[PDB]
Design a protein around this motif. Structure first.
Motif, PDB file in Angstrom:
ATOM      1  N   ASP A 183      19.999  14.011  -3.350  1.00  0.00           N
ATOM      2  CA  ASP A 183      20.093  14.665  -2.053  1.00  0.00           C
ATOM      3  C   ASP A 183      19.884  13.666  -0.917  1.00  0.00           C
ATOM      4  O   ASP A 183      20.575  13.723   0.109  1.00  0.00           O
ATOM      5  N   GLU A 184      18.931  12.753  -1.106  1.00  0.00           N
ATOM      6  CA  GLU A 184      18.660  11.704  -0.125  1.00  0.00           C
ATOM      7  C   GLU A 184      19.887  10.826   0.114  1.00  0.00           C
ATOM      8  O   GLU A 184      20.259  10.576   1.254  1.00  0.00           O
ATOM      9  N   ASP A 185      20.501  10.348  -0.964  1.00  0.00           N
ATOM     10  CA  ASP A 185      21.680   9.489  -0.841  1.00  0.00           C
ATOM     11  C   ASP A 185      22.863  10.228  -0.222  1.00  0.00           C
ATOM     12  O   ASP A 185      23.587   9.653   0.594  1.00  0.00           O
ATOM     13  N   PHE A 186      23.070  11.490  -0.611  1.00  0.00           N
ATOM     14  CA  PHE A 186      24.130  12.291  -0.001  1.00  0.00           C
ATOM     15  C   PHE A 186      23.955  12.376   1.518  1.00  0.00           C
ATOM     16  O   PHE A 186      24.908  12.163   2.270  1.00  0.00           O
ATOM     17  N   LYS A 187      22.736  12.681   1.958  1.00  0.00           N
ATOM     18  CA  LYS A 187      22.429  12.771   3.385  1.00  0.00           C
ATOM     19  C   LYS A 187      22.664  11.430   4.086  1.00  0.00           C
ATOM     20  O   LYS A 187      23.279  11.381   5.155  1.00  0.00           O
ATOM     21  N   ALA A 188      22.182  10.346   3.481  1.00  0.00           N
ATOM     22  CA  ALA A 188      22.365   9.014   4.063  1.00  0.00           C
ATOM     23  C   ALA A 188      23.849   8.671   4.215  1.00  0.00           C
ATOM     24  O   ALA A 188      24.270   8.138   5.245  1.00  0.00           O
ATOM     25  N   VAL A 189      24.638   8.991   3.189  1.00  0.00           N
ATOM     26  CA  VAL A 189      26.050   8.610   3.170  1.00  0.00           C
ATOM     27  C   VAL A 189      26.916   9.474   4.086  1.00  0.00           C
ATOM     28  O   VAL A 189      27.715   8.946   4.864  1.00  0.00           O
ATOM     29  N   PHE A 190      26.762  10.796   3.996  1.00  0.00           N
ATOM     30  CA  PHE A 190      27.665  11.690   4.721  1.00  0.00           C
ATOM     31  C   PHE A 190      27.127  12.231   6.051  1.00  0.00           C
ATOM     32  O   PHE A 190      27.908  12.531   6.955  1.00  0.00           O
ATOM     33  N   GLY A 191      25.810  12.371   6.159  1.00  0.00           N
ATOM     34  CA  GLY A 191      25.187  12.803   7.406  1.00  0.00           C
ATOM     35  C   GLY A 191      25.361  14.278   7.734  1.00  0.00           C
ATOM     36  O   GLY A 191      25.172  14.697   8.876  1.00  0.00           O
ATOM     37  N   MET A 192      25.728  15.061   6.726  1.00  0.00           N
ATOM     38  CA  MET A 192      25.916  16.499   6.870  1.00  0.00           C
ATOM     39  C   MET A 192      25.456  17.133   5.570  1.00  0.00           C
ATOM     40  O   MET A 192      25.234  16.432   4.583  1.00  0.00           O
ATOM     41  N   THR A 193      25.309  18.451   5.553  1.00  0.00           N
ATOM     42  CA  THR A 193      24.902  19.116   4.317  1.00  0.00           C
ATOM     43  C   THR A 193      26.023  19.103   3.276  1.00  0.00           C
ATOM     44  O   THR A 193      27.203  18.922   3.602  1.00  0.00           O
TER      45      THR A 193
END
Length: 64
Positions: free
Chosen positions: A32-42
């Protein structure tokens, strides 16, 4: 789903991808952390983008 480090998903040849990873949905295997860092959206917001736009965003980020 098992999670894998961003660097692993970005910089692994297709043939060397772990068997459980859907190569067309690498983002689902990020923490979840990496997803947020990469895409910046839910995750939900990303999934609501048209598929072509999801793919295009992923291309630059090395996750296509």
């Amino acid at each position: 789903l098992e999670t894998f480090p961003l660097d692993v998903l970005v910089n692994t040849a297709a043939e060397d991808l772990p068997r459980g990873v859907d190569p067309s949905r690498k983002e689902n295997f990020l923490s979840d952390e990496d997803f947020k860092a990469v895409f910046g959206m839910t995750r939900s917001a990303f999934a609501n983008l048209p598929l072509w736009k999801q793919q295009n965003l992923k291309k630059e980020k090395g996750l296509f």
